[PDB]
Structure 1
Amino acid sequence: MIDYTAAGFTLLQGAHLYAPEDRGICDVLVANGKIIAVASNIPSDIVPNCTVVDLSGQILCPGFIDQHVHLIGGGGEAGPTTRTPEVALSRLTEAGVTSVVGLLGTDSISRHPESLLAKTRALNEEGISAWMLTGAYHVPSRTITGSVEKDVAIIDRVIGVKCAISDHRSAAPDVYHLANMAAESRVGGLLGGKPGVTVFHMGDSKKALQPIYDLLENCDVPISKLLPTHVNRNVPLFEQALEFARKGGTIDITSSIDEPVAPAEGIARAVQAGIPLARVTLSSNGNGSQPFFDDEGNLTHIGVAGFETLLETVQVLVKDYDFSISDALRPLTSSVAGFLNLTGKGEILPGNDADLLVMTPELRIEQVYARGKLMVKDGKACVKGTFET
């Protein structure tokens, strides 16, 4: 016998496939971590040493891309005891996350981009796909090489920069600082082949999106590189976000915020307003703290976010909102890959990566493939982090 096992041939048979586009019942051929063929009825013997998988009666869709996760831990708003813990592989996979963008938040004193970068690498090495944003809430940005442009341009996992605005925990940056930072990300992105975005954590300040508007009037960074996140945190901010998207910007809704605008609600609303789903993404904020502040900017309560809200949002949208599953998936898949220009991700096409979700019809996760590898079986991780126990 001849051994063709190195190929990792895998045939995924007869699931109802959402690419996210409804492909109906379709097969998927995988080799070396890549989708090599997608079509109705694939001869299970088309290739040697092929592992056949019957997904009849099941749904197949692309793995989620969570562009907002505190991979190394976050928190700290109430002292050191509130420093959250690092993210563990199985937590991600089990929630259907095959691709992630790690970032830092409030604390950039006991939290470092070098550590975030190491964790990002560990995850890629463990089996999934991971990137990161340089910077943190603090502006000017705390980087690895000393320059935002140089970080985005030269650190392979860095794709953009993070900052915070309209929030009582910001560093009170002025327009110039913001503009420059954005411009540097923009430029380091062309050079490095990164999207070069700037992600803005939004707080509850009444100024809302103003800083983003000001910034626009003060530089030549395309509206397409700027991402306001946690837009559902408050009404008036949410409403502003809608017009921002309508002007051509993309807005990121956080799944970990149920009030005042719940995730599925925000998405449905966007759509009511005429916003194209391609301009709406959804992220978890996993492992970040969920601190609530007083009227005096006083902390009262503090929790930690998880990844389960992702899937839940989908379910709700489908289930309580009348979205088609296809539509329901976009913001976690194709919309995100689109905004971040994440190649080979977000869609089920030949040549793309074999990052797939096998779900039951009532949208429950059974299996997860990350780059062609079986990570989750029967809704449970079969592959765990080097130190998960």
Structure 2
Amino acid sequence: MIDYTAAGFTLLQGAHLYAPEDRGICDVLVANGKIIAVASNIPSDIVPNCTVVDLSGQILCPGFIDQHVHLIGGGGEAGPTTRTPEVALSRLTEAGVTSVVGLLGTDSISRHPESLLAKTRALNEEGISAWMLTGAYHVPSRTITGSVEKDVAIIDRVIGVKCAISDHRSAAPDVYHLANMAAESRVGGLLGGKPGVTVFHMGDSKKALQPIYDLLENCDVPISKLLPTHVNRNVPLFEQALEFARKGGTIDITSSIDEPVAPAEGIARAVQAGIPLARVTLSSDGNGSGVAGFETLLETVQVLVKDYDFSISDALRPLTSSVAGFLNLTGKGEILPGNDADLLVMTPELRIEQVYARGKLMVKDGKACVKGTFET
């Protein structure tokens, strides 16, 4: 018998597929970590050495893309005992996260972009998909190569730059500094084939988004590259964010911020305000500092469907297609032929059962079956 095991053929059968678009009962054929066919009634024997998975009665959807994770650990605002630990592979996978964007925050003294890059690469070797943002709250940014533009252009895993504004922990950046940094990210992305975004950690200053508007007034970076995050942290800020989105920007809601605007609520409000889901993303801020977890992501989807009247498809957008679109994550956020085989298998009540990353089974019966090198 010929050995075709190198293909890793996997047929996911009979689940109710949400691509996120509802596709009804539809099958998914995978080979080499890629989605090679998406159709009803794919023959269990279409390909050899095929692992057939009966997903009857289950739900199938794209894996989550969490664009705001402190991969190497964060914290440190109350001294060194508050530096959090690096993230564990299984914590991500059990949470349904198959793609991540790592970043740094307040501390860029004991935290380094080179370290973040190494962890990013470890995660990719481990089976998931990971990118990072150069910089940290500090402006001017602390980079790997000496320039934001050069980092985004030449460090493969770097997709944009991080910063903090309107926050008591900011570097008190002026418009010129912010604009130049964003412009550099933009240009570096073009060169490197990266989205070249600028992510803004928002604080509670009354100024809110003003720095972003000033920046817009002082440069030609498209508004589509400017991402304010933690927008639900305060009402007045949230309200500004809706306008920002109405103007063409994309806003990022933090699943780990419960009050004063809860995540689901935030997403619900956006839609009420007439903002298309494509301009609304949800991130966890996981692994920050207590120690932020990833459970709030799935919880958010559940709540949206359960308590807010969102369809399953719509509820998924902000964690899947909306993210992939904002970051130009080719091959992610959608179940289509040619895309990466990053999928979630859930109960009808939206409880995760299985997770596939790049076609590999990572979670089974809701428990990780692939663990990081040093996990216990």
TM-score, structure 1 normalization = 0.96
CA distance in 2, matches of 1:167, 1:42: 54
What is the CA distance between 1:36 and its match in structure 2?
A: 0.3
In 2, the alpha carbon distance for the partners of 1:197 and 1:2 equals 48
The DSSP-based 3-state class of the residue aligned with 2:317 is helix
Runs of 4+ in 1 over 6 A off after TM superposition: none
Aligned ranges for residues 218-367 of structure 1 at < 5 Å? 218-289=218-289, 303-367=290-354
Partner SS state of residue 304, structure 1: coil
Cα distance in 2 between the residues matched to 1:383 and 1:51: 18
List gaps (5 residues or longer) in structure 1. Answer: 290-302
The 3-state SS of whatever aligns with 1:53 is strand
SS of the residue aligned with 2:354?
Answer: strand
Distance (Å, rounded) in 2 between the aligned partners of 1:242 and 1:5: 50
> How far apart in 2 are the matches of 1:304 and 1:77?
13
Shift of 1:384: 0.2
Separation in 2, partners of 1:269, 1:173: 31
1:172-202 CA-to-partner distances (Å, cap 9, x unmatched) read 0000000000000000000000000000000
Q: Structure 1: how far apart are the matches of 2:270 and 2:13?
A: 36
Q: How far does the alpha carbon of each residue in 1:269-326 deviate from its partner, in whole angstroms, 9 at most, with x for none? A: 000000000000000000011xxxxxxxxxxxxx121100000000000000000000
Question: What is the DSSP-based 3-state SS (H/G/I as helix, E as strand, rest coil) of the residue aligned with 2:227?
Answer: strand
Q: Deviations 1:193-245 (Å, cap 9, x if unpaired)?
A: 00000000000001000000000000000000000000000000000000000
* 1:97-152 Cα distance to aligned partner (Å, 9 max, x none): 00000000000000000000000000000000000000000000000000000000
Q: d(CA) in 1 for partners of 2:287 and 2:130?
A: 15
Match of 1:380 among 357, 367, 371: 367
CA distance in 2, matches of 1:2, 1:72: 44
Q: Matched residues, percent identical?
A: 100
Residues 331-379 of structure 1: per-residue CA shift (max 9 Å, x gap): 0000000000000000000000000000000000000000000000000
Distance 2:65 2:266 in 1: 19
In structure 1, distance between residues paired with 2:78 and 2:375: 27
Q: Residues of 1 paired with 2:91 and 2:263: CA distance? A: 21
Task: Measure, in 2, the Cα distance between the counterparts of 1:148 and 1:126.
Answer: 28
Kindly state the Cα deviation for residue 255 of structure 1 after the two structures are TM-superposed.
Answer: 0.2
SS of the residue corresponding to residue 240 of structure 2 reads: helix
Q: Distance in 1 between matches of 2:313 and 2:56?
A: 19
Deviation at 1:93, TM superposition (A): 0.1
Residue in 2 that maps onto 1:32: 32
Show structure 2 runs of 5+ residues with no match: none
What is the CA deviation profile of residues 242-270 of structure 1, one whole-angstrom value per residue up to 9, with x for unaligned ones? 00000000000000000000000000000
Instruction: Give the equivalent residue in structure 2 for 1:73.
Output: 73
- SS of 2:142's partner is coil
Q: TM-score, normalised by structure 2?
A: 1.00
User: Structure 1, residues 23-54: CA drift from partner, whole Å, max 9, x if none?
Assistant: 00000000000000000001000011111000
Mapped partners of 2:34, 2:104: distance in 1: 31
1:165 Cα offset (Å):
0.1
- Separation of aligned partners in 1, 2:168 and 2:186: 27
For the residues of structure 1 that align with 2:48 and 2:259, how far apart are their CA atoms?
53
Distance between the aligned counterparts of 1:305 and 1:10, measured in 2? 34
- Distance in 2 (alpha carbons) for counterparts of 1:30 and 1:262: 37
Match of 1:298 in 2: none
Mapped to 2, the partners of 1:181 and 1:129 lie a distance apart of 26
Q: Take 2:13 and 2:231, find their aligned partners in 1: how far apart are those partners? A: 40
CA distance in structure 2 between the partners assigned to 1:249 and 1:48 by the alignment? 47
SS of residue matched to 1:347: coil
Find the aligned partners of 1:181 and 1:12 in 2 and give their Cα distance: 45
Looking at structure 2, the residues matched to 198 and 187 of structure 1 have their Cα atoms a distance apart, in angstroms, of: 11
